[PDB]
Motif scaffolding. Sequence first.
Motif, mmCIF file in Angstrom:
data_model
loop_
_atom_site.group_PDB
_atom_site.id
_atom_site.type_symbol
_atom_site.label_atom_id
_atom_site.label_comp_id
_atom_site.label_asym_id
_atom_site.label_seq_id
_atom_site.Cartn_x
_atom_site.Cartn_y
_atom_site.Cartn_z
ATOM 1 N N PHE A 135 0.822 -1.082 -0.034
ATOM 2 C CA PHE A 135 0.310 0.338 -0.499
ATOM 3 C C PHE A 135 0.816 1.342 0.157
ATOM 4 C CE2 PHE A 135 -3.273 -2.635 1.729
ATOM 5 C CZ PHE A 135 -4.389 -3.087 1.066
ATOM 6 N N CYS A 136 0.508 2.097 -1.220
ATOM 7 C CA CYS A 136 2.075 3.478 -0.999
ATOM 8 C C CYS A 136 1.381 4.333 -0.935
ATOM 9 C CB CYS A 136 1.965 3.587 -2.455
ATOM 10 S SG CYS A 136 2.798 1.888 -3.248
ATOM 11 N N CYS A 137 1.747 5.194 0.364
ATOM 12 C CA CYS A 137 0.692 6.769 1.081
ATOM 13 C C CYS A 137 1.951 7.409 0.739
ATOM 14 C CB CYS A 137 0.147 5.960 2.437
ATOM 15 S SG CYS A 137 -0.854 4.759 2.806
ATOM 16 N N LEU A 138 2.205 7.295 0.248
ATOM 17 C CA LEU A 138 3.912 8.446 -0.477
ATOM 18 C C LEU A 138 3.050 9.819 -0.536
ATOM 19 C CD1 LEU A 138 6.630 6.469 -1.371
ATOM 20 C CD2 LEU A 138 6.663 6.589 0.690
ATOM 21 N N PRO A 139 4.203 10.806 -0.097
ATOM 22 C CA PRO A 139 3.491 12.527 -0.767
ATOM 23 C C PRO A 139 3.736 12.711 -2.379
ATOM 24 C CG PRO A 139 5.191 12.363 0.864
ATOM 25 C CD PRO A 139 5.003 10.832 -0.193
ATOM 26 N N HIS A 140 3.109 13.556 -2.816
ATOM 27 C CA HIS A 140 2.813 12.965 -4.488
ATOM 28 C C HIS A 140 4.372 13.651 -4.823
ATOM 29 C CE1 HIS A 140 2.650 15.663 -7.895
ATOM 30 N NE2 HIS A 140 2.767 16.323 -7.951
ATOM 31 N N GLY A 141 4.441 13.462 -6.035
ATOM 32 C CA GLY A 141 5.961 13.926 -6.614
ATOM 33 C C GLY A 141 6.966 12.692 -5.535
ATOM 34 N N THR A 142 6.861 11.495 -5.254
ATOM 35 C CA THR A 142 7.662 10.922 -4.772
ATOM 36 C C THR A 142 7.480 9.316 -4.752
ATOM 37 O OG1 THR A 142 6.978 10.129 -3.212
ATOM 38 C CG2 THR A 142 8.072 12.761 -2.631
ATOM 39 N N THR A 143 6.227 9.130 -5.572
ATOM 40 C CA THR A 143 5.392 7.729 -5.619
ATOM 41 C C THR A 143 6.096 7.404 -7.582
ATOM 42 O OG1 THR A 143 3.859 8.357 -4.056
ATOM 43 C CG2 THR A 143 3.806 6.666 -6.345
ATOM 44 N N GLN A 144 5.843 7.894 -8.417
ATOM 45 C CA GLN A 144 6.452 7.151 -9.558
ATOM 46 C C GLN A 144 7.827 6.588 -9.768
ATOM 47 O OE1 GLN A 144 5.689 10.651 -11.990
ATOM 48 N NE2 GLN A 144 3.771 9.824 -12.212
ATOM 49 N N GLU A 145 8.896 6.844 -8.766
ATOM 50 C CA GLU A 145 9.939 6.277 -8.837
ATOM 51 C C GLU A 145 9.782 5.241 -8.399
ATOM 52 O OE1 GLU A 145 12.477 9.996 -11.269
ATOM 53 O OE2 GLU A 145 13.131 7.957 -10.359
ATOM 54 N N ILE A 146 9.720 5.510 -7.135
ATOM 55 C CA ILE A 146 9.441 4.745 -6.353
ATOM 56 C C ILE A 146 8.716 3.360 -6.562
ATOM 57 C CG2 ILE A 146 8.881 4.136 -3.724
ATOM 58 C CD1 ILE A 146 9.651 6.811 -3.024
ATOM 59 N N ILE A 147 7.862 3.728 -7.378
ATOM 60 C CA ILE A 147 6.430 2.411 -7.835
ATOM 61 C C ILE A 147 7.487 1.940 -8.741
ATOM 62 C CG2 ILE A 147 4.464 1.440 -8.244
ATOM 63 C CD1 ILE A 147 3.267 3.412 -6.458
ATOM 64 N N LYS A 148 8.474 2.709 -9.954
ATOM 65 C CA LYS A 148 8.861 2.143 -11.182
ATOM 66 C C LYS A 148 9.547 1.376 -10.440
ATOM 67 C CE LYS A 148 10.469 3.870 -15.194
ATOM 68 N NZ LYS A 148 11.442 4.961 -15.783
ATOM 69 N N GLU A 149 10.286 1.192 -9.242
ATOM 70 C CA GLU A 149 11.815 0.172 -8.772
ATOM 71 C C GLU A 149 11.368 -0.639 -8.333
ATOM 72 O OE1 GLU A 149 15.043 0.791 -10.584
ATOM 73 O OE2 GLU A 149 13.368 2.311 -11.493
ATOM 74 N N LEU A 150 10.135 -1.400 -7.804
ATOM 75 C CA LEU A 150 9.324 -1.901 -6.617
ATOM 76 C C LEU A 150 9.305 -3.307 -7.391
ATOM 77 C CD1 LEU A 150 6.321 -0.698 -5.535
ATOM 78 C CD2 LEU A 150 8.202 -0.779 -4.525
ATOM 79 N N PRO A 151 9.396 -4.399 -6.437
ATOM 80 C CA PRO A 151 9.867 -5.769 -7.707
ATOM 81 C C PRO A 151 7.912 -6.026 -8.389
ATOM 82 C CG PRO A 151 9.221 -6.266 -5.351
ATOM 83 C CD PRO A 151 9.575 -4.580 -5.384
ATOM 84 N N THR A 152 8.322 -6.714 -9.587
ATOM 85 C CA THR A 152 7.152 -7.145 -10.006
ATOM 86 C C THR A 152 6.329 -7.983 -9.540
ATOM 87 O OG1 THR A 152 8.431 -8.623 -11.932
ATOM 88 C CG2 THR A 152 8.121 -6.454 -12.046
ATOM 89 N N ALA A 153 6.654 -8.642 -8.326
ATOM 90 C CA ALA A 153 5.997 -9.847 -8.149
ATOM 91 C C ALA A 153 4.996 -9.392 -6.882
ATOM 92 C CB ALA A 153 6.868 -10.738 -7.337
ATOM 93 N N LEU A 154 5.216 -8.159 -6.533
ATOM 94 C CA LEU A 154 4.433 -7.388 -6.055
ATOM 95 C C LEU A 154 3.066 -6.903 -6.653
ATOM 96 C CD1 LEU A 154 6.743 -5.038 -3.562
ATOM 97 C CD2 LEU A 154 5.468 -7.212 -2.694
ATOM 98 N N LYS A 155 2.146 -6.901 -5.265
ATOM 99 C CA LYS A 155 0.974 -5.795 -6.047
ATOM 100 C C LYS A 155 0.918 -5.373 -5.741
ATOM 101 C CE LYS A 155 -2.527 -9.521 -7.749
ATOM 102 N NZ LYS A 155 -3.132 -9.463 -9.059
#
Lengths: 345, 345, 345, 345
Positions: free
Chosen positions: C73-93
């Motif tokens: 569950f991602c509750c990060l502050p705007h303008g910080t999510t895209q790059e972090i989520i892009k780098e998450l493993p792919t076996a993660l929902k």
Amino acid sequence: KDIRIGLLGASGYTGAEIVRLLANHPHFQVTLMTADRKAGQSMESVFPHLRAQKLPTLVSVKDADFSTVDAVFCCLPHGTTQEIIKELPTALKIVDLSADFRLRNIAEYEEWYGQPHKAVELQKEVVYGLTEILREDIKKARLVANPGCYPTTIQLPLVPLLKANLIKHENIIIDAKSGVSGAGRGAKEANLYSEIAEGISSYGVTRHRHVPEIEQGLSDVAQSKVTVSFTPHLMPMIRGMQSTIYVEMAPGVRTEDLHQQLKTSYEDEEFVKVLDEGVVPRTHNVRGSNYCHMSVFPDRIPGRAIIISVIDNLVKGASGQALQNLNIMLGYPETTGLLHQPLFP
Amino acid sequence: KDIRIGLLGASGYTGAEIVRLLANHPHFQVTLMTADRKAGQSMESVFPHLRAQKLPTLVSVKDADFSTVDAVFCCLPHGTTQEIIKELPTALKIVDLSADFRLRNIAEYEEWYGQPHKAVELQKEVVYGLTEILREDIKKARLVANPGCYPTTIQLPLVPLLKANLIKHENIIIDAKSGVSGAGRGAKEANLYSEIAEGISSYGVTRHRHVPEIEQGLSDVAQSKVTVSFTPHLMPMIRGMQSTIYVEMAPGVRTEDLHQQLKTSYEDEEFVKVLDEGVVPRTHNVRGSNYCHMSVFPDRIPGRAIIISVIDNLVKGASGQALQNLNIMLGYPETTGLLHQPLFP
Amino acid sequence: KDIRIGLLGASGYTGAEIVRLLANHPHFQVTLMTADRKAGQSMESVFPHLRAQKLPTLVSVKDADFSTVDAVFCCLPHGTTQEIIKELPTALKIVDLSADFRLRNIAEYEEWYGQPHKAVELQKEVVYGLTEILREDIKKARLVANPGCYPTTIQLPLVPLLKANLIKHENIIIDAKSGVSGAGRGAKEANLYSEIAEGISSYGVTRHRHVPEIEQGLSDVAQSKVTVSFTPHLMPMIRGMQSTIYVEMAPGVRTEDLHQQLKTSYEDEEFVKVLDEGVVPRTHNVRGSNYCHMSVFPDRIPGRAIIISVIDNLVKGASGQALQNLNIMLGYPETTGLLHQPLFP
Amino acid sequence: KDIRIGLLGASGYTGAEIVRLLANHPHFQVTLMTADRKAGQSMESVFPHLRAQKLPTLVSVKDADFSTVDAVFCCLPHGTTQEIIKELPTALKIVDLSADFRLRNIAEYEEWYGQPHKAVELQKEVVYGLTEILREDIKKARLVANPGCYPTTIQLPLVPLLKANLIKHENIIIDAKSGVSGAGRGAKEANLYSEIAEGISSYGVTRHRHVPEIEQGLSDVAQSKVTVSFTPHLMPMIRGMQSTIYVEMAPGVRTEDLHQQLKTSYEDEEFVKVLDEGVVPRTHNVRGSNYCHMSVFPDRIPGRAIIISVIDNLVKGASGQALQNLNIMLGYPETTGLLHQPLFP
């Protein structure tokens, strides 16, 4: 579900709380709800926030048949409880949320409630429902008198301390605060938003019906008649209750001792949390849950200590404790359907 | 207008209150205003609710010319006020709303405020601004230390009672409550609406900076060192303050005596109202005014009494009293520009 | 139990809500929690109301390992999510509660959010999390963009109506209201209790970041570009949200038709309740739950209708819907751990 | 003082407001107050917050001698006003705060109020008390119908715009909000603190008694029958009112034009402030004062504009305007005793 519940007096806030709590209880199901003026109506009509639930139409207590009910929660007015409960079938486990069966001394009930006790005999088999303290007696009781809200916040911290002779029993001063939900849903001018909001005031000064209830519990433990000072205060908020308790410690006793005794007495208790030293509890933190947080502090006056105890007046102060009692009375785990976490913010 | 007022530290709530109160004051006019981070800003920028008034542009303390004003109100924080006030022109009448000049004992100020008193000499010519009690000294003072909010609600009732030896000075327990406006406009997480609303909590337990202020006033009257128990509580409301005071009456003294003494001591006082015995005051009733309502009740514990004292923490608890003091210091009627009636509901 | 949950950005209100909701979720368990500004700190230290829970220690995103968790569950502050989520493993929902993946038009994201989209490619596999509408697509998505609060209250009622051509798509005017909890826990002057309480005000007039989100959803259904008028209003309350929607009905269409379409579209939906014609919903009634109540009324202006839609902004408007989405994404019943009943009063 | 004031119906909030406002009015003095149910009692018994004032003892209408006063403020119940006012002595200047004399069309009054107009003749000499608009007619009127709260916030901005043909008269949509004080002090379940706090809801949907009042004022200016959409909303706060008005600008007109027209129409008006474009007004900013702040904004929908208008519903929305009208009716300065500054925070 395998347990059928009857709710006497479902149109008030404590009734709504019972229904809310039971909604996700795995074994108890409401199958009978009684109301007086609103008999015949559905509860959605009374409380629309409950529309997600399928509940039975409200009927009169006088037309209710308990042959298919296993246990009952009573939320009737002071004035009716005693005679109604007395005429209830014996096969029923009963938890009365009213104050009519809390006092064991009959004369005492009469002087404080303005009317004779109409179930004197039944009164002697009643067990006070302060769960963490009288758990063992509660489990084998048929009729339980659920404690009042303020009394609950006061006895939980003081009983263990008095039992261990850590505090004197004279000059125990209690300055309590409560959200207005404790005043009920009665349509009274004094409780309108415009009258309550943005201000506070004391009430029940000198004499408040919870006084005898408080002293009874403390007197039993101290094995001496305890006379306290208890002053309620009305807060501009819905839920929440705090008792700021000013006590005199016993000779040689320090605040650390009171803290250790409390920490020990409630270490394995789910619903009673003893906070670390100097940590101030907040009613905001137990809001919407069955938890009680308490903390001990030194008083500036040598020999004295300060105890803060908070709860959600509608849950652990009422319906939450009622369910806590019924759980064990029926042989189910005490915390069943009572693990709701505080709704903060 | 006749008098030109200087306001040091106008960006806070007490500053806004000063401006609000002076708006319709027939003789005092704000001609100079100080702000820190918001210096250079129009006050419509800081407090848009003041847009109906034509006020000066905010400047920095360092750029303010004090020979341009007749009297000054200081609303800076504790620990800044001493050196600034010490360097202010000798022709100025000054009312400091901070706590920096309230304590006469230097060592006492240091232990409670965490820093050396930087105006030791000036301190001895300072008069405590509790108007109804030190009126005569206040009139001829150049520098007045305006009392804190809580201390005001406590000393008004207790001073007269101690002076008349109607109550003992041991075990005076004070359980006080205050609206969150007393915490100031500082942008802190703890004071957000979502954190404060729908709940209460104690704060400043055991030790709170108002303690020495409270004891100083009581000790002076009792002519003996008085040690009290004082516990603040944060209320989910903007304005309002109540102290519920638990005292021990002197031997043979009844609540009726305390009531009569208070009624006599304040019978001709505009801002201090003593209600009839048994009547419970409400903070709602003094909200937005400079009034203080107090009442006396018997405690359930024999020999003890309960005193309730309420005010609007921002007015009689701060800026209202400040103006009350400046009025008489400048030779004007005490109630000038202070007759605003409570805003209820 | 079975599912391990990771929470990125646990120090905010939406994070606290996730933790609260999962507390009694039978299959999901929080095992990892991010919060850099407070990494290495205990959650109880940030949110003391959660002390009944045994929660993991807070860790920096960098120091966190996500192949320990099954979903995030991602509750990060705007303008910080895209790059972090892009780098998450792919076996993660993944269910992102931020707004960074809601808009499919890249240029649109940039003009409204003030920065380039930093995960353009990933964006095309994202599914909008408005559960009742895109349920089927949500079930098979890996990355879901959880809708904003206001947009949820608006699309639920309007999508079905537009799809059935029951209302015109021009001049849809939305006057919305929200509790201040939606502003977050950020320590800002504007959100202090003293600044918010006892008053209201509009905000985000003309242009508010939810506008493009709202129009995207409506445009997709109307198969034509929809331009709406949306005006937010800040309410002096913690939780709760209402959108009062003013629409023009299609030729020949009556309010009864809108009502029937809504009643039909959501008849078997647990969380979306269509009230009987004329009944006015109240945010009080869904407070603390994942429910949405809506009702249709005729407008005095012929040809127009009024739609009221309410939810608890923190639950169905945020964390509740997020969990609703993760449930089905992981193959569990949609209502799992989301049957909490409204906390009223 | 010079003028003697009679107050009919002093036990309600508008009555209390009249008394509060007149307290520091240099020329008007309350000498007669009527509160039937609570006749014989003291005003203090009803509104203890007024104890600083020396008011006459409450009387019954049937026992009041109107030859003793120069002017009267009527805050009586709807339906009891027409016949009482019709019988009042001719020498009295009267300001009726009820809605019974606002509508000039008799049939219109009957359909919206459910009863025949019982003072048809007197009705034709009544002047609508929207001060800034009908000032000249008000000055020479004997009987003035003080406008309702909502209507005041709506007509002030729209009348000037319609008069200048800057906006179309079709599709004027008004989404209004009000503090619960507008509901009165009547002891009703729906207005209890526990029922109102922490939530909002619409009311008077489609048909609300202010509709005809609003349309009458707008129709007179547009010289064409105007049909509006008006939806009230109940706010969890005591005082405060805001109307968010959605209008269609006339061909060729821009928001700048609406702003200039408003700025020009009210530039020298003490109580009506037009804020700079883009600045959002807050009900918090006029709380406890007789001021109205309004601002204009462009709507996202081309050709449309948004107007926000706020007031304290109890002051400029009621008793404040009533006094504003009586001032000029008696030949005194309009702002006399009405310069109270907003009570913020």
